């Protein structure tokens, strides 16, 4: 049972990529019965305010130092335009250890390429925005065999996704950490994807059970 | 020269504005003559707010520092807090903003706040659900102008259900005219559909 949820926050983070996931987690509104919200703690490279791609100035809760990643914690890595920059190297090292103790790591979009370049997708099923671009941009990536079309893929305690697939991303994380029942996750997914109202009535009657 | 504002407040629903504010603030798929349309965050006061997702955001400006002009954009996200009094000031200013010709863009619960000030009485609009809007908005009399949407653009007002951030983004983006029509259809179908060929076509038409 997952006890903490971390979102890594950095200048340029892509807003559309984590919004569904973090809102459902932090509110707990559609969690199954007797399950309290999974509070999302924002973690920065340091305590400096960051500005999203959308321009939102955010105050990190804690700094990477202050943060402990533990078996079954959740760590969200959003896309952004800055992931090769070397400001991210310390978290990228820690991610290696996190993955070992069994912390669920959820990477979307360019975060997927950060991981691909550290060797970590070499023997896990994964997706990314584009295989050809990931190979060009990631010299130490040897996971081509393990690569799938996705747009979201789940393997043990790693979820990767394309940047265009935030609902699918959110759905797979939500499912991995077992926070909704399977009825509520399907109807939630279908309502958001399809906008058909049968799914709103499904979802209201599946939640909290 | 025109500006973009986002109303930030406690409870605001992260997924609802996220595509919109990134596209605008980055300017990345804009026609090549257009600079990014920077998204200024406007709070009720200048205090830090927490999003539904837990993000602690520092408003750029207070509502009193904000001047809304013709063809400016105000984005009003959804949240769980809209009947609270904190918001009556913005809700009064939404009235003259619509009069002056500012583009007002309301999603989710923000739709029901505008319904209960009567701004949606005689203007095509949508919301999350008309029966909830009916129940929860005692002085709303717009049912005849209500459509299923899930996004509706009427003159300078865009409204959507919270369930449709892509359709919302798309309509706002269209209204302010910042993408080619082709780039916007492609961005949209890219996001809805996930077919990669839409990204190639988007990239091929940003300056069509």
CA B32 to chain centre: 24
> Do B30 and B4 contact (CB within 8 A), yes or no?
no
The experimental method behind these coordinates is X-ray
- Kindly state whether B10 is in contact with chain A, defined as any CB-CB distance less than 8 angstroms: no
The verdict on A200 touching B (C-beta cutoff 8 Å) is yes
* DSSP track, B139-194: T---GGGB---SEEEETTEEEE-TT-HHHHHHHHHHHHT-S-HHHHHHHHHHHHH-
**A163: nearest CA partner in chain B:** B191
Cβ burial A105-126 (10 Å sphere, 16+ → b, else e): bbbbbbbbbbbbbbebbbebbb
d(CA A27, CA A146): 34
B26: which chain A residues are within 8 Å (Cβ-Cβ)?
53-54
Residues ≥6 apart with Cβ < 8 Å to B91: B113, B114, B117
Between positions 23 and 52 of B, the ones with CB within 8 A of A are 24-26, 38-41, 48, 51-52
Which of B42, B159, B145 is CA-nearest to residue B107? B159
DSSP result, chain A: ----EEEEE-TT--HHHHHHHHHHHHH-TTPPTT-----EEEEESSSS-EE-TT--EE--SEESTT----TT-EEEE---S-TTSGGGHHHHHHHHHHHHHT-EEEEETHHHHHHHTTTTTSSS-B--S-HHHHHHH-TT---GGGB---SEEEETTEEEE-TT-HHHHHHHHHHHTT-S-HHHHHHHHHHHHH--THHHHHHHHHS--
Q: How far is it, in rounded angstroms, from Cα A207 to Cα A204?
A: 6
Say yes or no: A169 contacts chain B, CB-CB below 8 A. Answer: no
Residue B117 is part of which domain span? 1-208
Looking at CA atoms only, how far is residue A61 from chain B in angstroms?
Answer: 8
CB-CB contact of B160 with B149 (8 Å): yes
What's the structural domain count of chain A? 1
- Whichever domain contains B185, its CATH number is 3.40.50.880
Beta-carbon contacts of B22 under 8 Å, excluding residues fewer than 6 positions away, are: A14, A15, A16, A52, A53, A54
């Amino acid at each position: 049972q997952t006890k903490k949820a971390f979102l890594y926050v950095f200048n340029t983070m892509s807003d559309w990529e984590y919004g569904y996931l973090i809102a459902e987690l932090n509110s707990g509104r559609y969690f199954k019965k007797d399950l309290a919200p999974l509070k999302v703690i924002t973690v920065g490279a340091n305590k400096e305010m960051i500005t999203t791609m959308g321009g939102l100035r955010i105050k990190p809760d804690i700094s990477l130092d202050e943060c402990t990643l533990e078996s079954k914690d959740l760590l969200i890595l959003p896309g952004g335009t800055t992931w090769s920059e070397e400001i991210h190297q310390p978290i990228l090292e820690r991610i290696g250890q996190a993955l070992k103790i069994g912390t669920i790591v959820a990477a979307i979009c360019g975060a997927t390429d950060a991981l691909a370049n550290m060797g970590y997708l070499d023997t896990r099923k994964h997706t990314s925005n584009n295989l050809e671009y990931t190979k060009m941009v990631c010299p130490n990536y040897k996971g081509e065999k393990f690569y799938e079309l996705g747009p979201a893929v789940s393997d043990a305690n790693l979820v990767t996704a394309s940047g265009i697939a935030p609902l699918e991303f959110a759905m797979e994380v939500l499912k991995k950490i077992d926070v909704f029942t399977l009825d509520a996750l399907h109807s939630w997914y279908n309502l958001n994807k399809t906008h058909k109202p049968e799914y709103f009535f499904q979802l209201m009657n599946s939640i909290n059970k």
